[PDB]
Amino acid sequence: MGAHLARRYLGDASKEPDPLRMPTFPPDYGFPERKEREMVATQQEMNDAQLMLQQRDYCAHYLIQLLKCKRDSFPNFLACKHEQHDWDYCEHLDYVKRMKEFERERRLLQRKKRREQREAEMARG
Amino acid sequence: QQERDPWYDWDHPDLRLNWGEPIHWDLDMYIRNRVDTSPTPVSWNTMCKHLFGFVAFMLFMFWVGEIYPSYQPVGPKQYPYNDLYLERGGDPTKEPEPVVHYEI
Amino acid sequence: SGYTPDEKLRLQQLRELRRRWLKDQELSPREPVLPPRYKTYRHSIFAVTHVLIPVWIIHYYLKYHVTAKPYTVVERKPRIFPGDTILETGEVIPLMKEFPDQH
Amino acid sequence: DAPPLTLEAIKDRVLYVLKLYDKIDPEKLSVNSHFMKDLGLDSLDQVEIIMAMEDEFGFEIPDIDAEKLMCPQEIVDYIADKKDVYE
Amino acid sequence: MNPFASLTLTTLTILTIPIMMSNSNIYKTNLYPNYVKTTVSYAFTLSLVPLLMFMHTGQEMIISNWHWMTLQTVELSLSFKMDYFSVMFIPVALFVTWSIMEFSMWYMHSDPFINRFFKYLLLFLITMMILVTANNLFQLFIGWEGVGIMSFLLIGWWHGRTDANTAALQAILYNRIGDIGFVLSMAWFLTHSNAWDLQQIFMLNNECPNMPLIGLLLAA
Amino acid sequence: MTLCLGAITTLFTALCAITQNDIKKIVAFSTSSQLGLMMVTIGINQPHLAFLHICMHAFFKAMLFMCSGSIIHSLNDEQDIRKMGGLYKAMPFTTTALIIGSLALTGMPYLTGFYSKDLIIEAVNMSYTNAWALLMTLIATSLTAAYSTRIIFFAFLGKPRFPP
Amino acid sequence: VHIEPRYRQFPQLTRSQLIQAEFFSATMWFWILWRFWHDSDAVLGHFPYPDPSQWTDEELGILPDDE
Amino acid sequence: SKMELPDYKQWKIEGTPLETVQEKLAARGLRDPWGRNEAWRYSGGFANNVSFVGALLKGFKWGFAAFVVAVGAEYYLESQ
Amino acid sequence: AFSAPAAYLTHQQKVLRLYKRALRHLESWCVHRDKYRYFACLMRARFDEHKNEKDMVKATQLLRQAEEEFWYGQHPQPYIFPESPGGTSYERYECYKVPEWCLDDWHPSEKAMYPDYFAKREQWKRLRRESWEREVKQLQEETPPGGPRTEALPPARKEGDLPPLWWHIVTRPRERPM
Amino acid sequence: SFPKYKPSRLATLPATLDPAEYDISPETRKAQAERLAIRSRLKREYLLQYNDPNRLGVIEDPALIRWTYARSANIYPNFRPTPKTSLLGALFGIGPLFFWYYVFKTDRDKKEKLIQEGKLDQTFNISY
């Protein structure tokens, strides 16, 4: 649900991004110096914690901390609110990073369309 | 036998038959536990048309929704170690093609 | 349109007979002549038998018969988190690195 | 489950319904009154009376039998015999 | 020993106990419904205990107590998979069945065969427990067909009602089409994986194909 | 295939439910619609939410069937909402139990059914799913509310319609 | 307790069932209000949804069209 | 035991939607003779019934008071 | 059920059955009592409007059109009483109905458990056996030479007789046997 | 006016909508009288046998005996090889056999071709 579906289907699919092919531009295209994402939890730590493969994303350390907090205070199942909020906030930040990637792809596509239209106009004239 | 009268004092109430009357050749399939031919509030042709139309329309719309899916304005999810190369059963000896995710 | 006199008479006679039959169907004060041959206590007897005996038998069967052949009872290995104390060897699994904490 | 019916109870309830009928004068209504010979109703009125009794006692009277119930005593006897009432 | 396996198997066994007592004077008396309800309550609490054990440390187990038969390279054994799904669904089902049994004590008081009704309810519960805790496809199929036939027997409770008989047979027909799908999936899994248990099926089927998954979908 | 089958099942069963007059039939169609919702949950790759909804549905649907059975038994084996009525004050406890069960079924913001159905709907909307399946799921939720209102309205509100 | 049947009249009720029904309805409403007071984020959301139109091309790494 | 039927004269269609039906039928030129037999349903304890919104809010008044008291007690405990 | 059927339904019987069926389906449509009373009064008004009609051909055509209107406008799921043939509680107790011939195959110990019931049962059996010849004689005296033209049976014309063919009607199982 | 109801073989025409129900000839009434007379004669015979106190056993039903006999033992003596019967028998008894033969032979030929070419996933197929 959203306006992006309307723009892509009842509009210019060339200008709108394709979720199954994104990204289609190099990561450094437009970023002079871009920093690689940092992973806090190690493979051994995640493997020992037995996180499900879907849960082994870049927010895994907060999930591990939440699990450890829940296990220790077992009878009191309401004593992990801070850890839960930390994990949720990290997931929120990851989601907004994904949204930024989608928006960057979209405006790069429309900039490419403008550039190619300008080149075609110049070649014609 | 479903079409037969339920208020009559049949000799066999469950089968709705009388003793001595001729038995239909297909009584074994026209019993009340089996094929029913009693009249319906709507015509058979109308019922068939409506049912077929509903199922065909639903199949067509499922295909249309498949070719025009619904999603959110987000990019692909990112996983740390070469999209979890080893965790998904990859070969430790062979070196995977690196996958790098950058901040934004 | 209505009952003919014969139908009325037959129905009256049949209903009288039916009522007499039902009155006969009634039983007697001595009729079911049988041949010669605290709440906590009931719950206590129920609990020891129905719960204690099966758990005894099943624990005996599992501890000494089922858990005597390899791989019959397989427990999923316990989850190990950073900053933990493995009890088998007195091992200390170290804490994670410093988080880039926000707010 | 439910309390058993009795002949007096059936008679009381049928007379109660018939007295709540407007086309019937309550004073001259007795258990032997004929719906058409001495009450002045017609076929549709008898049909409505039978339907009211069906609603009252919660069971259906077949049309083959309901056409002949021309008296409150006949209705009482029919309902009692169908419900297996003997007292 | 860890109480987990003992307590789970004990709940299952004490569910099966009142069926054994169905050839006794207690079954001939009128105390059988209350007896069965009390048994279900005790089983419910005894199953609540391993749920507490799981929610603390996330304990899961499989118990291959009895070995049935070895078809050359395939071993079939009576195995129960006591995991999150089983230890979370058993107490809920027992709670619901306890409430339903008390309601049926009130509701079926006039039925001449209330004792048989309670025996049948307990048999359905036993088959459902077998289905839920089954670790291999054959035991899962046992529970599958058991709940199917118990549904057939309980739908047609009033044998004199032709509508009840038609409903029972119709339920059987649809569940048998589902069983067609189930047998397709079982045959494919055994043929292409030499296993009827979830552990080896998951190990060997890194990319499970359309034929077994569609068989399972049709059964479901 | 699982997602599409679940979507059409929940929609069709709710649509049939909103216009039935037998209370047991209404509850049976509600059960079928909830199963279709569970199948939708599986098809969007959320198996654990399906299990959670299984538990919650067990609770409140069993209670709803018990309440309808109490109504039927109190009215001499009558199973028609056309002949029920006035039971809001005639039967207090079964009335409050059925109202609570209907609120749980439709996802009252903090009852038993809220912790599963709300998450299921959120996951369906936020996933890469079939557009028609999403639309059918939403319509089925609306029709769920509709038939719960139908049960309450024709069974408890109004004037009696049962034999005197 | 034995409840006698009524004919064309409202059935006889009991103080016990009245108070029990009232107590359980009040319990449901108290629970709903109490949970909404404490954790209202489960209904109204917890984190704001960003507006993509407000993200600058500089921070999205988009070069000017001429460049 | 031996339940007694209430007197039949008490059932009337006055102050009942049945009298509105009777007025409509009188305007049409007709009458319905079964008014009172149905009029038992509209009187007595059956006369007043809550609405759909009123039915849902069966225990809101006591529940809200308990919620206010509990919130006040929690606030006092947190402060002290 | 208790009345022998006739060869055909007269016009009055047809119209009365249509009237009852229409009233029942209208009650199914109009759930509430006041609305049902209003529309039932209107329906009876239509029947009374066509009540006086000397032309039987026109009356039959009116009946035919009314039947077509009913079939078009019938309720798809009309209300059926629980014990009625379409009802949900129909034939529920047929599995509990056991006959008295099945009763007489009891073991002597079982029979001894109910000493008083079986004395009256023996009395009933003697009464049945002492009357069969009179019943068959009465039946064969009153039948026409061609045979029975209808399914109705005669009453007992004599002081000491019972109506012919009475045993199973009198001793039929109760509607709630167990 | 109102839409008409079209009867089918599985949804027959109701009696109230049958045109012959409202066109009664005097011969129709005598036909109905004869049918009722036949039914009443049969009913009387069955009832006399049923209420006979000295009867122990089963009232044999000649109609049921005729039905069971005509369903099984009377079919072959009354069968003649006709074009219709020959075509229907050949179809229903030969066509399915060769259809299934073609299906299975084609499937097994493809499987054997894959096996010979050595590009069929036969790993873990220990049981056969």
Ligand SMILES: CCCCCCCC/C=C/CCCCCCCC(=O)OC[C@H](COP(=O)(O)OCCN)OC(=O)CCCCCCC/C=C/CCCCCCCC
């Ligand atoms: C795998 C091969 C099978 C594929 C499907 C073939 C269907 C074959 C049908 C069975 C033949 C019938 C023989 C006798 C059956 C039992 C006797 C009988 O007919 O009783 C009818 C009985 C009673 O009727 P009521 O509606 O209850 O009315 C009651 C009125 N008092 O009703 C029935 O049971 C009919 C059931 C027949 C089902 C036919 C359609 C089945 C649907 C199959 C297609 C659906 C595929 C599903 C796709 C799933 C996607 C993963």
Ligand SMILES: *P(=O)(O)OCC(C)(C)[C@H](O)C(=O)NCCC(=O)NCCSC(=O)CCCCCCCCCCCCC
């Ligand atoms: P009593 O013995 O006085 O009965 C009088 C009768 C009716 C027998 C007359 O003596 C009589 O035969 N009169 C002449 C024939 C006649 O009146 N025919 C009328 C029958 S049809 C008619 O005209 C009225 C039918 C209109 C209503 C049709 C119903 C259609 C709607 C049904 C909808 C169902 C759900 C709403």
